[PDB]
Ligand binder design. Structure first.
Ligand SMILES: CN(C)C(=O)C(CCN1CCC(O)(c2ccc(Cl)cc2)CC1)(c1ccccc1)c1ccccc1
Ligand SMILES: CC(C)CCC[C@@H](C)[C@H]1CC[C@H]2[C@@H]3CC=C4C[C@@H](O)CC[C@]4(C)[C@H]3CC[C@]12C
Ligand SMILES: CC(C)CCC[C@@H](C)[C@H]1CC[C@H]2[C@@H]3CC=C4C[C@@H](O)CC[C@]4(C)[C@H]3CC[C@]12C
Ligand SMILES: Nc1nc2c(ncn2[C@@H]2O[C@H](COP(=O)(O)OP(O)(O)=S)[C@@H](O)[C@H]2O)c(=O)[nH]1
Lengths: 55, 344, 286, 335
């Protein structure tokens, strides 16, 4: 019964839509350079707007 | 420049620090133990031979934490029953509708809703239909919740350990037993219920005082039930070898127990030990075979200058079991105090 | 003339060795390892005691060299009070370290809760407080008197000068030599017998050489304390009893016997800190 | 019999993935500027845990965080002012996971007791009680994440994940199919999917509503300990014991990027992306965190300063800080 369930699960995983790696990597890049100014760990923010400062 | 909010937060964190400090001071005085072994070794009889204290149930620090659990379980069980008999008066229906309106709130059920279900108990067929409902997924202690909850109604409703164990969820995995012996506190952990992967939680201990590996001695002529070709004693030997030469347990001592002292003796008064060890033929007597098994089980310890193995025999032995564990633990404590003192 | 040269030289080398050792021990035990254990707090406080004790050596050295104390009564009070107070703290810290190790070995269940950093802090504060109680009479009794045209500063006393003088001699001989030696020998002897009775230090070659290593360290500590402190106390006692004439040999011997106690203060960081295996592990990463 | 059918079905899936690949992620991002050397400083150090920290989770307000350690405590901190708002004494000292409710009204934990305990942080009494104890797992609880104020998805040692109704106490949905101990799960940003990595070196995407598996990713070798979605929810990165992080993809159903180095041989315990997703952080067993560039597969920073194994790690929601815990009983906050 486990083999039949595994075959059915693998068949359901087989018949799914796939998009090319180029367009998905381009989408990842569009997300990365669409939010570069919103990443404080990427571009170091000024200490005026930094809530983690020494006391 | 800081107002009273920062001062209150600082004081709250200060008292949290005091609580954490005293909790860590109390916990560092304990002795942690990892009870290991194969199947049917005799660990349950070893723990039963301790018989000092074998449970928990602190008076106030954990009874407060389960106060809303009792009300939540009572409300969930009664709504499970009222949704279970479906799918003799309408006053009970009105009371149930009043229950369903206020069922979203928890914490203050002990007076008003308690009185409402107390008046709702006039029906006699509701318990019969609850007993009839054995198919729906509901706790069997619904009446065991409802019966003793409404007998007392207090604002600071803090019950004893009977109601805490009533709502307590049984632990399928780790089992903790706390016992004390001669002004020193122990804490035993049975990981036999964890059948998932030893290599993913065996590092969770990392600094237990000792390991109380138990080995049944009668398994020298008992074959494993899952393979029928390889011995049980060699499975115990492989498990002990994997426990000894673990990177996480590299310096901890092992209080090794050899369990069935009379069973293997009456076994070897008929069948020799050659079937378990074909390379061994010295005697079929009790003493020489026991010594040979112990020495063939101790040489698995690869490092013989840092890790010490203490071996004992059991099966209706007196308090010498607990005394042996205490002697091993005090030797480990002396070693740790020498290491802390800069003398080792 | 060369006797003053040799006395100045021995005071200088003892002072520089003690200051360097007890400063490097403090630097290691502050920067690399911390005061998160009882023994590290004890070692740091012993280092403070030894370093402040041996910082008075230039003053005594220049006092012997000139024969006249020009620093006034306030600086003499400060120097001699620091000397007595820090010698007593160093001796008390040695005693409490021996007591700590004896409790750790022979009484392990009680040492589970007694040996905590907070209790070590309380014991150290108590050590410095009792040394204050024993050294505030040195604060209120030291003065700079005049004799033979030269200026010298010593301890003055009441009208029964002999009684208070011999009382201070007694309270230094018993409370800093006799009581510490008995405590340290009893504690270490019981600890050594108990370690000879333990399983993990017997039954093999490596366990036996380890047990011999702890035994040798114990014997070295006791022998260094006894050899360094015996000649000065014996010299003080027999100078109180009989009248030793003032000569070159007795002056050189008296200053050498003074330097022996400060040599114990110099050798305390070597014997206690640098011979710890925790310190050896901290030096092993270098 | 049917094993050959399953083998040829898996080969068909592999061939579809191979024909689906036409350009490497390194080729697509070969013309972008490197992120440069990123050097964060320890702004805060959260002292107070006395034992081995195993997990942490930031709050949605980006100011509080809960951490769990093996002393049987569960401390909520104020990261801005280095305070302890709460300290919950756990019933079981063995805890391996902790979660923070998105509303902040609840907090979860679990471990070797096979129980996911939920704690009400905002009771009218003032202290912290227990709202519900979730039972039904025969293995240790290794991860838990709140969908919302009422539902939580958990992973267990019994090679299955599960979804719970907190106010009821039972499993509404069971996720089965891992042939190995699932160790960590991460929730999608839209709270409709989740992905979990297991000890069979496979990461499976599940559906919350219908409870079925959509994709399986088998690029890793030893076993998965870390997993975290990309901020857009169309990718995730998996840490493992073979000293490798791998970026997988939802729509492509493939392997995109491998973050590994020759002198790194220790396992990865935890991963988390930054807000933009350009910066994937990962904790390791060699006592420090390595900051990776998720587009270029090169190391941009090193977060040292932990004396023991960096076991947990998490970037806050607005991206202003990353907090890493460690086996040396200390938490650190970086910026
Ligand atoms: C008196 N005895 C018997 C001691 O053993 C003594 C103290 C000797 N020390 C010498 C210099 C001194 O005279 C001095 C200081 C400043 C000035 Cl401006 C002028 C003179 C003050 C006293 C000791 C002997 C040897 C080495 C170290 C100490 C000691 C040991 C233990 C505890 C307390 C005292
Ligand atoms: C009674 C009067 C005269 C004594 C004056 C000096 C006292 C206040 C000073 C001198 C040296 C000091 C100690 C030096 C080092 C330490 C270790 C530290 O981890 C805790 C405090 C502690 C233990 C200090 C306590 C205060 C102390 C004992
Ligand atoms: C047990 C070990 C430490 C040996 C102890 C040695 C003691 C007893 C020795 C060391 C220095 C010695 C003194 C050195 C110088 C003099 C001056 C001389 O005109 C009379 C003897 C006298 C006063 C000596 C008496 C004995 C003495 C105090
Ligand atoms: N005569 C004799 N019988 C013993 C002894 N110890 C255990 N047993 C039997 O063995 C089972 C426990 O094994 P158990 O399954 O709990 O082990 P475990 O490692 O899974 S906890 C029990 O039914 C016992 O009658 C002993 O000394 N003498």
């Amino acid at each position: 019964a486990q083999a039949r369930k595994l075959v059915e699960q693998l068949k359901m995983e087989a018949n799914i839509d796939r998009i090319k790696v180029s367009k998905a990597a381009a989408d990842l890049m569009a997300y990365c350079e669409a939010h570069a100014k919103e990443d404080p760990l990427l571009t170091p923010v000024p200490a005026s707007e930094n809530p983690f400062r020494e006391k | 420049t800081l107002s009273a909010e920062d001062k209150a937060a600082v004081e709250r964190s200060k008292m949290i620090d005091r609580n954490l400090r005293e909790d860590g001071e109390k916990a560092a005085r304990e002795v942690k133990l990892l009870l290991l072994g194969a199947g049917e070794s005799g660990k349950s009889t070893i723990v039963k031979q301790m018989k000092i204290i074998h449970e928990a149930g602190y008076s106030e620090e954990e009874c407060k934490q389960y106060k809303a659990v009792v009300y939540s379980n009572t409300i969930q069980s009664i709504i499970a029953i009222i949704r279970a008999m479906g799918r003799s008066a309408r006053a009970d229906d009105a009371r149930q509708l009043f229950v369903l309106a206020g069922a979203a709130e928890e914490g203050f059920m002990t007076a008003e809703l308690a009185g409402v279900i107390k008046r709702l108990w006039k029906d006699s067929g509701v318990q019969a239909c609850f007993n009839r409902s054995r198919e729906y997924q509901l706790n069997d202690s619904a009446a065991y919740y409802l019966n003793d909850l409404d007998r007392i109604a207090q604002p600071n409703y803090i019950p004893t350990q009977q109601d805490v164990l009533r709502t307590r969820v049984k632990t399928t995995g780790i089992v903790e037993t706390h016992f004390t012996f001669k002004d020193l506190h122990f804490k035993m952990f049975d990981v036999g219920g964890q059948r998932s992967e030893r290599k993913k939680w065996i590092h969770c201990f990392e600094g237990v005082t000792a390991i109380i590996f138990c080995v049944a001695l009668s398994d020298y002529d008992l074959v494993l039930a899952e393979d029928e070709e390889m011995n049980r004693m060699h499975e115990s030997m492989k498990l002990f070898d994997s426990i000894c030469n673990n990177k996480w347990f590299t310096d901890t001592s092992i209080i090794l127990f050899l369990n069935k002292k009379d069973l293997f003796e009456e076994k070897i008064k008929k069948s020799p030990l050659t079937i378990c060890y074909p390379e061994y033929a010295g005697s079929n007597t009790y003493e020489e075979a026991a010594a040979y098994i112990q020495c063939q089980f101790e040489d698995l310890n690869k490092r013989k200058d840092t890790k010490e193995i203490y071996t004992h025999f059991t099966c209706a032995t007196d308090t010498k079991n607990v005394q042996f564990v205490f002697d091993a633990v005090t030797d480990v404590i002396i070693k740790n105090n020498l290491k802390d003192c800069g003398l080792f | 003339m060369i006797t003053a040269i040799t006395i100045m030289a021995l005071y200088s080398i003892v002072c520089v060795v003690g200051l360097f050792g007890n400063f490097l021990v403090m630097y290691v035990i502050v920067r690399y390892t911390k005061m998160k254990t009882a023994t590290n707090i004890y070692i740091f406080n012993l280092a403070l005691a030894d370093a402040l004790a041996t910082s008075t050596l230039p003053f005594q050295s220049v006092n012997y060299l000139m024969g006249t104390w020009p620093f006034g009564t306030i600086l003499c009070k400060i120097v001699i009070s620091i000397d007595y107070y820090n010698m007593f703290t160093s001796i008390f810290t040695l005693c409490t370290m021996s007591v700590d190790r004896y409790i750790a070995v022979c009484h392990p269940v009680k040492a589970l809760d007694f040996r905590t950093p907070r209790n070590a802090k309380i014991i150290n504060v108590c050590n410095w407080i009792l040394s204050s109680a024993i050294g505030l009479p040195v604060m209120f009794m030291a003065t700079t008197k005049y004799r033979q045209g030269s200026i010298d500063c010593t301890l003055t006393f009441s009208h029964p000068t002999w009684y208070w003088e011999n009382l201070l001699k007694i309270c230094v001989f018993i409370f800093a030599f006799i009581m510490p030696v008995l405590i340290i020998t009893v504690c270490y002897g019981l600890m050594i017998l108990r370690l000879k009775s333990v399983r993990m230090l017997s039954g093999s070659k490596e366990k036996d050489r380890n047990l011999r290593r702890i035994t040798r360290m114990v014997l070295v500590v006791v022998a260094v304390f006894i050899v360094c402190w015996t000649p000065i106390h014996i010299y003080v006692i027999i100078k109180a009893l009989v009248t030793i004439p003032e000569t070159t040999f007795q002056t050189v011997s008296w200053h050498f016997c003074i330097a022996l106690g400060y040599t114990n203060s110099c050798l305390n960081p070597v014997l206690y800190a640098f011979l710890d295996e925790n310190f050896k592990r901290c030096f092993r990463e270098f | 019999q049917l094993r050959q059918e399953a083998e040829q079905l898996k080969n068909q899936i592999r061939d579809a993935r191979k024909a689906c690949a036409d350009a490497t992620l390194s080729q697509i991002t070969n013309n972008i500027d490197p992120v440069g050397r990123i050097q964060m400083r320890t702004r805060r150090t959260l002292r107070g845990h006395l034992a081995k920290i195993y997990a942490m989770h930031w709050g949605t307000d980006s100011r509080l965080l809960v951490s769990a350690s093996q002393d049987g405590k569960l401390i909520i901190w104020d990261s801005y002012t280095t305070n302890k708002v709460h300290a919950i004494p756990l019933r079981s000292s063995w805890v391996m996971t902790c979660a923070y409710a998105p509303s902040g009204n609840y907090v979860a934990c679990g471990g070797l007791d096979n129980i996911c305990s939920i704690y009400n942080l905002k009771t009218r009494e003032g202290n912290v009680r227990v709202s519900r104890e979730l039972a039904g797992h025969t293995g240790y609880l290794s991860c838990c994440r709140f969908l919302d104020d009422n539902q939580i998805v958990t992973s267990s040692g019994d090679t299955t994940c599960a979804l719970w109704d907190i106010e009821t106490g039972q499993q509404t949905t069971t996720f089965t199919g891992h042939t190995g101990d699932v160790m960590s799960l991460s929730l999608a940003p839209d709270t409709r999917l989740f992905v979990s990595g297991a000890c069979d070196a496979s990461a499976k995407l599940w559906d919350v509503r219908e409870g079925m598996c959509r994709q399986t990713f088998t690029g890793h070798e030893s076993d998965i300990n870390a997993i975290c979605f990309f901020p857009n929810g169309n990718a995730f990165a998996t840490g493992s014991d073979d000293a490798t992080c791998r970026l997988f993809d939802l729509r492509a159903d493939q392997e995109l990027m491998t973050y590994s180095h020759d002198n790194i041989i220790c396992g990865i315990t935890s991963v988390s992306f930054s807000k933009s997703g350009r910066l994937l952080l990962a904790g390791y067993d060699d006592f420090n965190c390595n900051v990776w560039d998720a587009l270029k597969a090169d190391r941009a920073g090193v977060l040292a300063g932990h004396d023991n194994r960096v076991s947990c790690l998490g970037v806050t929601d607005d991206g202003m800080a990353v907090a890493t815990g460690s086996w040396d009983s200390f938490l650190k906050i970086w910026n």
